[PDB]
Design a protein around this ligand. Structure first.
Ligand code: 5BL
Ligand code: 5BL
Lengths: 343, 343
């Protein structure tokens, strides 16, 4: 697989990323200790995930550029831009983990929860963000798409931040209000907080690196990619409860943490005034008894069948979007990604 | 005064900054609530200071550009870039206030300490940072210095963050270690954390807006400006204790908060092993008795006279630096700023 194979070369390039990012320690030994801290931040937070967003950059680059044009340097730049996508995510996760008081991320203790880190992780998340632009300068400065990539990473940060704000306003900590847990609000939180950086950003970066800088081609790619992003998060919210941690590697937390999951949202539009009272009394409590009662109300309202029909209808629609908005890009850029997302 | 007069037009332009930054609410009413939160973040955190760094941009622009070239648009851009410097500072302050557990900033409650804000201020500080690049795009996109300004703001953020890391490593919360409170470390924390964004960034932005984009001219301006920055923070650490809150508007906190102040640093290089023990026992305690004992040990080691001689020697050196590195820039760009800084 285009992904599975390239995932080794991708992860092997992290060693160079770290070396280059900690290189100013030579000329400026004054800041050596801060550079040593940066290295630990990169090593803890950029490593441990699946690297799929970063990998999407490398995979789309190979499918958008003529093999003849894909020289050693072009490839080193594609892996660097892939790692910039991974550093953007690492900065948002370090910060979000602090904001929602998380304990673990991918079964490892959150960086901020580590002894001696604490709220210093706020500066660490900022440093992870600064690393993107340092890498873009170091490798893509002389490239004609340099400014396009800077603006894309900056716009993606802003859209994710707007999304994060929307999420925090929708679900205040120590506040029970299912009235604001609407579908229209859910689609908006998903579009800004996840879809842009996870789906639009990787392909968009590959597109500019290929010289595809047209506004219409980017709007066309955006139409497909955000729709894929909307499906993905809906699948993430579903598998969190109605899935299995064997295949996924994540156990149900959405209920205990009062999250604006797609499940609680569809329960809202389809409920008798009595069924709405049951949800209000249970959702948000860390007692295993109350968590068990929520899962039951979803099952009765036939939400697994509501998701199953949503997935069938979603896949069909995304195939229709690819036919309509892929050209002139090779459909395989969108298809390779859709295959990995859908089941 | 070039500052005092222009400070009214500068502050009057904040209304337009907010209007333009909250304008995407029209086409995207989905995110309206997040835009409403952004507006409150801007209004609380960008207003209330003295605006001198932002003002430096406007003042240097007028002294670097021919009056004939200073049209309505050029001026609107200079005020916008000035406000970008103020938003960069607002983002660092919101975040630093969270990290060191501050209660107030300029006598007003810290944003994060406000009811309902808490750790959400982490996303708020990020949004303040995103606003810089949104403003640069909205007003300077078509300008030839566009990329120069983006890279300058990005490099200034990174240098401040590196400085902040250096500070946090030097003074760990709940940790007494005066061994790492050296002069060489102090000058490094001041250079990266304060000097670059406070002194280099405003003039540098004015310089690029004037078409002065040469590497040597920027290195020349940097040599003067960082030296001014080093003096400024040393004066800030001195006036915090040996100053008066009537003129300054700040009362002594450095002692109670175990900060790496220039006073404690000069006390280290000039102390008998017995005088070092006294400092260790007192510095860092919130008891008014222990705070009073520190001030006494400084006075005996003739630190106000050590600062007085430092200020005399510093002003002389900065006049020598201006003679040597101002040309071809009009010396009045550096002099107007030096006058405001020195006494
Ligand atoms: O952090 C990661 O890299 C990560 C972690 C868990 C994942 C789970 C699925 C998945 C769940 C059910 C069917 N498929 C898909 C992807 C994914 C794969 C390929 C490309 C991607 C691009 C953007 C976002 C995700 C992906 C995945 N990526
Ligand atoms: O937040 C602010 O704008 C602010 C607050 C307190 C201040 C105190 C002094 C001051 C203390 C003793 C003699 N002078 C100088 C400036 C200052 C004035 C003009 C330009 C500047 C450029 C960068 C940094 C500071 C300034 C000042 N600026």
């Amino acid at each position: 697989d285009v992904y599975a194979q390239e995932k080794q070369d991708f992860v092997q390039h992290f060693s160079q990323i770290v070396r280059v990012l900690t290189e100013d320690e030579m000329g400026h030994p004054e800041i050596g200790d801060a550079i040593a801290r940066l290295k630990e931040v990169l090593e803890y937070n950029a490593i441990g995930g699946k690297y799929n967003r970063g990998l999407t950059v490398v995979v789309a680059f190979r499918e958008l550029v003529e093999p003849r044009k894909q020289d050693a340097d072009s490839l080193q730049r594609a892996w660097t831009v892939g790692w910039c996508v991974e550093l953007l995510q690492a900065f948002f996760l370090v910060a979000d983990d602090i904001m929602d008081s998380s304990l673990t991320r991918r079964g490892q203790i959150c960086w901020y929860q580590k002894p001696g880190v604490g709220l210093d992780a706020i500066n660490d998340a900022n440093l992870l963000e600064a690393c993107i632009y340092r890498l873009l300068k170091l490798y893509c400065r002389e490239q004609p798409y340099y400014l396009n990539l800077i603006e894309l990473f900056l716009q993606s940060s802003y859209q994710t931040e707007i999304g994060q704000t929307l999420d925090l306003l929708t679900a205040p900590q120590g506040n029970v209000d299912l009235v604001r847990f609407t579908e229209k609000r859910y689609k908006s939180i998903v579009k800004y907080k996840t879809a842009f950086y996870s789906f639009y950003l990787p392909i968009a970066a590959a597109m500019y690196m290929a010289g595809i800088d047209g506004e219409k081609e980017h709007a066309n790619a955006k139409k497909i990619l955000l729709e894929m992003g909307e499906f993905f998060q809906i699948q993430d919210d579903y598998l969190d409860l109605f899935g299995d941690p064997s295949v996924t590697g994540k156990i149900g937390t959405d209920i205990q943490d009062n999250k604006c999951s797609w499940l609680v949202v569809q329960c809202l539009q389809r409920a008798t005034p009595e069924q709405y009272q049951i949800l209000k009394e249970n959702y948000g409590q860390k007692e295993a008894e109350k968590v068990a009662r929520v899962k039951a109300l979803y099952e009765e309202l036939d939400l697994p069948a509501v998701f199953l029909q949503y997935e069938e209808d979603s896949y069909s629609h995304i195939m229709a979007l690819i036919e309509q908005y892929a050209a002139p890009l090779p459909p395989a850029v969108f298809l390779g990604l859709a295959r990995k997302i859908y089941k």
